Amino acid sequence: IRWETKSCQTASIATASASAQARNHVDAQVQTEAPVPVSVQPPSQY
Amino acid sequence: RKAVIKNADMSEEMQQDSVECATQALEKYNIEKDIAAHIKKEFDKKYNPTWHCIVGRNFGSYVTHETKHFIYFYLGQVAILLFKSG
Question: Nearest CA to B70 among B24, B13, B4, B15?
């Protein structure tokens, strides 16, 4: 005959943002040098 | 075939492999395309594909590489560009 009223509640939760990324690239530039440290005719005496 | 590294974005161990691979390639192969091919293939095997190699005496380039996978160096008078992309 005794009806008791009760109130229930569950705990809340917490989320968080995040990200993923594959490997990254970057540019590059090269110029080949053309040095010619060469004389005309060295008179050798080997 | 003395090696001089001009620029690199590469670990020291990979730099050594780059020189050693090119050095062997130059000892074995006389033709530029064949030297390049040797070098490229050795890197695909050990460091996975996709590598690209340019070997020559007169060129300029503008390329994109994967971080930490770029080297540009000379062996004597010949420049070698070795990098991964894709």
Answer: B15
CB contact at 8 A, B23 and A42: no
Question: What residue spans define the domains of chain B?
Answer: 1-86
Name the DSSP letter for residue B74.
E
Burial class for B25, CB neighbours closer than 10 Å (0-12, 13-18, 19+): buried
Way it was determined: cryo-EM
Nearest-10 Cα torsion for B46, B36, B1, A43: 180
Nearest chain A residue to B56, by CA: A32
Amino acid residing at B34: D
Residue B71 · residue B83 · CB < 8 Å:
yes
The CATH homologous superfamily to which domain B1-86 belongs is Protein Inhibitor Of Neuronal Nitric Oxide Synthase; (3.30.740.10)
Sort out which chain B residues have CB atoms less than 8 A from A28's CB and list them.
Answer: 7, 9, 62-65, 70, 72, 83
